């Protein structure tokens, strides 16, 4: 159906370990959107076909305002392109870079915008494991949407594939290669809580080694600006066992995000 004739391409909007995105208008309507392209060369040689068949089946069937639309794919024979939803506000990461530290108001409603996306998420057992500030993007009128479904499954789930960069938002059982589900999200859901009000998230570390053993002990301390409850929500999802973090509709009602989010469950 759609080609690469079909497109005028616009500005680098991003670069990933395999994706590189632009903005793209579409010839006969106008219609702006984002294209992400894999090179072929680069998927087969690491693998990593099953991901991006994933990302294209559960992305293109999900449907909720804090999730990145993808409206379909083509591809030409060296290279892949997936084309998406354009977030103009561009990434959460970026913003974060912007302004050192989130203030209260702006990291609940945030958690908030999240834990709705993951609810639906997950009453689909779809568990997104890779929940991350480069990975989260903004659309127009500045709310969140979840994007970059490459390593999402459905649960239980076990890993078959090698881990790439930074092990920060990752839970325990899944560093130690063990079995998971759902409440990997609820993990990072805390580590992101923390990065957004301090500015770097909880276990950070100079080397791999090192960050591995704060994760695997759930080694973190606050700084003294950070309030009781927002420590309360963030210990309550930094738990080792995952069976003790809380429902995603527990993070949603407890007191902290009532009394600060500008925006509903
Ligand atoms: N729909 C989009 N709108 C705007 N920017 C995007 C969009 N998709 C990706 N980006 C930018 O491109 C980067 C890489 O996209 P991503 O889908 O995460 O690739 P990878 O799978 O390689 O991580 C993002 O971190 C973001 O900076
Ligand atoms: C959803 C489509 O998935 C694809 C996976 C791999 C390839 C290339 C690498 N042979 C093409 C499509
Ligand atoms: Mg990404
Ligand atoms: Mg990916």
Redesign the pocket.
């Known amino acids: 159906q759609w080609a690469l004739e079909d497109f005028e391409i616009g500005r680098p909007?991003?670069?990933?370990?395999?994706?590189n995105?632009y903005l793209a208008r579409e010839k006969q309507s106008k219609f702006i959107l984002?294209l992400?392209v894999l090179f072929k060369a680069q998927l087969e040689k690491a693998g990593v076909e099953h991901q991006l068949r994933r990302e294209v089946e559960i992305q293109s069937h999900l449907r909720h305002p804090n999730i990145?639309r993808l409206y379909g794919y083509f591809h030409d024979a060296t290279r892949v392109y997936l084309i998406?939803?354009?977030?103009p506000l561009?990434?959460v990461?970026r913003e974060l870079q912007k302004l050192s530290k989130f203030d209260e108001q702006r990291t609940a409603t945030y958690i908030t915008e999240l834990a709705n996306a993951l609810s639906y998420c997950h009453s689909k057992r779809v568990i997104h494991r890779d929940i991350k500030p480069?990975?989260l993007?903004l659309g127009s009128a500045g709310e969140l949407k979840i994007?970059?479904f490459?390593w999402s499954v459905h649960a239980p789930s076990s890993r078959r594939t090698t881990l790439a960069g930074t092990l920060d938002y990752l839970p325990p059982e899944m560093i130690e290669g063990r079995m998971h589900d759902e409440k990997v999200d609820l993990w990072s859901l805390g580590v992101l809580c923390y990065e957004f009000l301090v500015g770097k998230p909880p276990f950070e570390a100079n080397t791999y080694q090192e960050t591995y053993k704060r994760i695997s002990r759930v080694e973190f301390t606050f700084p003294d600006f950070v309030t009781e409850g927002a420590r309360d929500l963030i210990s309550r999802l930094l738990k080792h066992n995952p069976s003790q973090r809380p429902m995603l509709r527990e993070v949603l009602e407890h007191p902290w995000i009532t009394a600060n989010s500008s925006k509903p469950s």
């Open positions: 909007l991003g670069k990933g370990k395999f994706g995105v984002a992400k990145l998406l939803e354009y977030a561009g990434t990461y480069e990975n993007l994007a970059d490459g």
